[PDB]
Amino acid sequence: NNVGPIIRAGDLVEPVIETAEIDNPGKEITVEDRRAYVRIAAEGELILTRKTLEEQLGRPFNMQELEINLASFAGQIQADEDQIRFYF
Structure with a gap:
C-alpha cells in the first residue's frame, strides 16, 4: 500500500x-x-x-534529474514535465 521513491544517498534527499x-x-x-x-x-x-x-x-x-537519481521505487509511475506520481 506504501509507494514512493528510493533515492541514492546525497544532497537531493x-x-x-x-x-x-x-x-x-x-x-x-x-x-x-x-x-x-x-x-x-x-x-x-x-x-x-x-x-x-x-x-x-x-x-x-x-x-x-530526480528520475536519474531513483535507484528504485515502489508503486506504479505516472510522470510528465510537471510531476511524478507513485501510486498503488
Whole structure:
C-alpha cells in the first residue's frame, strides 16, 4: 500500500523529503534511511512536483534529474514535465 521513491544517498534527499511533505497534504510520510540510500513512502499515492522540488533546491530543476537519481521505487509511475506520481 506504501509507494514512493528510493533515492541514492546525497544532497537531493532532504529537498525530496520536504517535497513529499509539501505536495501530499494530510498524509503520513515515512522515511527509511538505509545510509547508502533512502526510501520515502506514503499510503496509496505519493506526488512530487517539479515546482516544489525546484523551490526546495533553490536553483533550476527539471524532473529528469530526480528520475536519474531513483535507484528504485515502489508503486506504479505516472510522470510528465510537471510531476511524478507513485501510486498503488
